[PDB]
Amino acid sequence: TVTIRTRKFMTNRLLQRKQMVIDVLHPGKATVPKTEIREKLAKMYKTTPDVIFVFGFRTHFGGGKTTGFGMIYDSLDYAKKNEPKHRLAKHGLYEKKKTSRKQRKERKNRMKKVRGTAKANVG
Amino acid sequence: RQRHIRVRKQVVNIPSFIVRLDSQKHIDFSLRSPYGGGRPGRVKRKNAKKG
Amino acid sequence: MKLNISFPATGCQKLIEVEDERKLRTFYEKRMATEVSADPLGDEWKGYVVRISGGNDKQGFPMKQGVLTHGRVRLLLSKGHSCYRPRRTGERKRKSVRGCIVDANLSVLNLVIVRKGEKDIPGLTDNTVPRRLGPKRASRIRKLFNLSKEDDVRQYVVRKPLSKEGKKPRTKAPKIQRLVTPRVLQHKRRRIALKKQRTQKNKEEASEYAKLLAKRSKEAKE
């Protein structure tokens, strides 16, 4: 049923990664989730699903096939450095601070009024 | 338009799909159509569970 | 009129309100340059001499030194001028400033004690406050003490007692800047090394080019 191809593998020793375009064949399934693709990609490359980052799965019309992109790092430490913070947030690794960007500009423009150590008391 | 016709393992839904020579011998029913090798439609499945 | 008096010797200052205008009649003609005696201010100030260092008018505008008037004027204040802070490099905003001449229409008049009199004010002269910051430059320490060029400024550091309630006590010392460290001697030594590498490469590039023209001119000579 569900298979994986990786038709455009690349070593890419510059970022300690493994670039490839993942093709998933799912005739009856519905756009196989990342958790099933990562664990199926870990046994394909003899690695752990904790260092596999897949994204960009776009299912073709009619169904049965979808194509994406995958990243396999040498270690989890090299992943936390080279992988964007938003894909680490898709895992239990990175936690983005709820800062409410609209409110960040408010505190900044208020600190632009007072001068000195009193800026810390503003916000 | 009802997603039954496919062209060489691609469900084509456009009637104005201009078929070329190498794609003419590969026109067949989709692998999920009740006419092809697929589960029958909702009408057949609903009329079956009644009786 | 309120009086903001400060004592530079003891580092103390206090604000007092002088309701009796007879005591301020001496100041009503002195500019922001003279040191006058504070005898009319009361029996506590006997022998004191105060210097008019500035003040604010009834609208809050500060006194600007050199205007030579007693009314407010508007001057194009650039960087470096008092009573103005540029928000952008090269900004000149015309602001209203109070003249240097001291009159009765002032909110507060700043005074600086230039000579201690006979008695002493409890809140102005009795109490004292340290400097709160010792010298940081290596030469400032040598001038503070009697240290010569042979003494170690690392031993004669301030090392102020920094201890609050709820934490472990410790001592904090400032980083001695402009100090002759073994590192700064390496930079000076390496700067000289590069000056000799260029001198070495100039005489080589000029010799090899002279040797090239020498052997080449011998060919075209015949």
Added chain:
Amino acid sequence: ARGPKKHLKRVAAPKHWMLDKLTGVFAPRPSTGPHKLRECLPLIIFLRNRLKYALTGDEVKKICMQRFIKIDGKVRTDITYPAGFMDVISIEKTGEHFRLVYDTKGRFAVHRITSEEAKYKLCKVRKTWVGTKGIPHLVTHDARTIRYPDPLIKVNDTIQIDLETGKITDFIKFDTGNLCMVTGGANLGRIGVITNRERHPGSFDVVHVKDANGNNFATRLSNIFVIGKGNKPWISLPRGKGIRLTIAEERDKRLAAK
């Protein structure tokens, strides 16, 4: 209009960069450097668009900041470095060495070279002046000032320098019979033997180049970069050296390889 411009639109970008439309509004504006804006290939495009080593501009900066890339031997951390013609892009981490040389289509193709190569590079002299104390100087096409050059080197010859020391190793004089790669549009990337030079006083000197297959074509003197003495190039040439197959011949070679 009040000063220098610091942006570059994708529609106004050089065409040989081969940038698409729907990716973004701005194109990577190459920082100031040895090569001109219209005649260079910024490091972000070469790593991402060509080598596919990175997918975004942020991933390009993660590579350049690790000091893995050396242009002409020296490490460059700016992702918008010009890195124009004849420049050597050495990547010690992956053991790959490149040299930017145009193809028949007039674009910087991925030209991988050997470890024995990537130690030298060819440079075209553009200006010769005598400095102070009677010291002759030199100006290559990549802003490399060279002191004490060979007196036979003139304002149009091609020198060979060493990337480790920056000293002139050899030089090729500009004369009829030497190779050259045109670098001035409509012939950008074509390699042939110089056959004739038309000298126009006060104007641009037009030279005539002849390919190996016999194709003749003219260009300007400022677009000629001497490659080798005679017909032997001193550099490694990419596939399809300078022939520039016609649209009819490229179709035949396209369908024959099917």
Added chain:
RNA sequence: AACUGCGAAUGGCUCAUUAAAUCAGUUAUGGUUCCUUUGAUCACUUGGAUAACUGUGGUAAUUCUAGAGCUAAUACAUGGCAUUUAUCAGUGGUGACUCUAGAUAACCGCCGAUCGCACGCACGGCGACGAUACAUUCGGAUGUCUGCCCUAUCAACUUUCGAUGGUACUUUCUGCGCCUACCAUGGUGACCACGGGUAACGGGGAAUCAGGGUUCGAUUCCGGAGAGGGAGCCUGAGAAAC
């Protein structure tokens, strides 16, 4: 937090102005200015001020600030070339120098008091920052050639108080009536000057089209212009900046 450094002169928006102007093609700076990038070139470890901070304040009010007490620097300051003429000769040049260099007579800034890492043998490696008489890049500025709609119910126009040219300055980043002084009386025009209109930013372009055309282009790209209307400036490599 603050000092210092840098950016804020890009972007974004609008089409008011503007009809040989802008703009487009061509091209010249041998008449020029350019932060940055790139390659060349290169001890008495000194002096006293200041912010943050501490503290006293004023005003109804401002991203207003005053006074006093401190303390740092890649802040501030100290500790042969270049610059300006004159003469002579002819290293590398260009189609063409009053070019680039050289030699004289002089005239009168620059030549590192900085920072990190690695630590080895009074000497030492790798960098950061910083100097520019240079080159280089981003490019400015002003010229060369040619090209614009309607209008004669606009036929002569410019020239006091520059119009055209000459001479010597002044000034500018430079060439130039740019300006000044003294002379010359020119310069433009039915091949349409000058004046007026434009519901005129120019161009790449769009629509419509057998050919030929007609019309459109405020509008995502390039160039210019402006930031309510004018005008004058600061800072800086760069602005007549909003």
